[PDB]
């Protein structure tokens, strides 16, 4: 779920003889790779989200005043989705919390619902017009990690996301970086950009130690999967209890270049 | 690499691999054992992470093969019994991500032969 529904949920349409705005407020806390998700207006309702844009900018101040984009903000960020409901709006987005190894931070999004009332007034005191506002707040609490995520960055020996990471010196026999995985690790790798990924849904699939590729569900079903293509960067999380020790690799090659080859060794825990 | 340790057995025996590595080249690498007979591919059958602390099978010898490392003298062992007509085969030494970087790996040798009679 990990969702503000501002359509459904924490409705913000207005009552009969509503005089006053009233704010609501979402608060999520998501884990890293976990996705959140924004619903705000419909083909018959007519809300909108501020910023706009939103998750690609976001507010960083909770009375929605310090505009940031996202990719500045909380460094990682990368992968977001959105939809229409109704032409011309976006109504429906979704962002995955990249690995953060800063503290806590939150950022907000609003949704708002807008109409003009008369107050109908008596005795010296006149009918007059009033604006109010049905705001939804969106509170998303960006988490923090502790310790770096095991894996390879294979840009840099000098990574602040990942365990291990090798020098352009070094990737310019082929590398082969192996991590010891256990239920609920984090896990993921970083590829140089010209580099290609084999297999192309490395996480959801991988190739096996007979070299073939296996789909990974029933066997080391790997959830809250980021295969950002844009960056060559690869992350997921073992499952929540492993029951068989098993070996899957992903591979990155550039034609004349060494391959780049990225390892999991998964061991029996819970 | 030095292969070795092939050859003739019965049906139900027992045969020990060897695979002596002179040098460092595979040090940073999880080993395996592989095996191709004329008409099939080349497959795995088991392997040993560098430190010999983890271990994983072919199914189809889960249970009747032992792999197994030295690692002061650089060597692996593939410990072999109830042999059956079925791992007749070329047995093969190399990292255990040879087949999946495919014709990229630079190290296969002509491995040791293994016949089971019936
Ligand atoms: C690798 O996957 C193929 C196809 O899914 C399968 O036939 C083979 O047995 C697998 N090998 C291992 C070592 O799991
Ligand atoms: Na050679």
New interface residues.
């Given amino acids: 779920n990990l969702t503000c529904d501002f359509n459904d949920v924490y409705k913000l349409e207005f009552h009969p003889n509503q005089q006053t705005s009233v704010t609501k407020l979402c608060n999520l806390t998501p884990n890293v790779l976990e996705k959140v998700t924004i619903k705000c207006g419909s083909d018959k309702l007519n809300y909108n989200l501020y910023p706009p844009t939103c998750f690609e900018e976001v507010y960083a101040s909770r009375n929605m005043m310090h505009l940031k984009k996202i990719k500045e903000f909380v460094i990682g960020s990368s992968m977001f989705m959105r939809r229409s409901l109704t032409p011309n709006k976006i109504n429906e987005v979704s962002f995955r919390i990249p690995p953060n190894m800063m503290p806590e931070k939150p950022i907000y999004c609003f949704c708002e619902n807008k109409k003009t009332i008369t107050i109908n007034g008596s005795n010296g005191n006149p009918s007059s017009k009033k604006d109010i506002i049905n705001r939804g707040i969106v509170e998303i609490i960006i988490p923090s990690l502790n310790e770096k995520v095991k894996g390879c960055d294979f840009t840099t020996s000098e990574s602040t996301i990942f365990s291990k990471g090798y020098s352009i010196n070094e990737i310019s ?2 590398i ?1 970086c ?1 991590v ?1 995985a256990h239920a609920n690790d984090l896990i993921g790798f970083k590829c140089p950009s010209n580099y290609s990924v084999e297999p192309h849904d490395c996480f959801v699939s991988a ?5 073939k590729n296996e789909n990974l569900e029933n066997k080391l079903k790997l959830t809250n999967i980021i295969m950002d293509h844009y960056n060559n960067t690869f992350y997921s999380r073992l499952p929540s209890l492993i029951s068989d ?3 899957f ?1 992903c ?1 990155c090659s550039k034609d004349n270049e060494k ?1 780049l ?1 990225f ?1 999991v ?1 998964a ?1 029996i825990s819970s | 690499l030095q292969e070795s340790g092939g050859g003739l057995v019965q049906a139900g025996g027992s045969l020990r691999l060897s695979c002596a590595a002179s040098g460092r080249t595979f040090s940073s690498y999880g080993m395996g054992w592989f095996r191709q007979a004329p008409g099939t591919e080349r497959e795995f059958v088991a392997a040993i992470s560098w430190s010999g602390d983890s271990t994983y099978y072919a199914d189809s010898v889960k249970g009747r093969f032992t792999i197994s490392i030295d690692k002061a003298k650089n060597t692996v062992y593939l410990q072999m019994n109830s042999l059956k007509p079925e791992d007749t085969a070329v047995y093969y030494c190399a990292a255990d991500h040879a087949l999946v970087v495919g014709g990229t790996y630079n190290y296969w040798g002509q491995g040791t032969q293994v016949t089971v009679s019936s």
């Fill in positions: 026999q082929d082969v192996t010891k190739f096996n130690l007979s070299g020790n098993w070996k690799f591979v391959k080859v390892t060794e061991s």
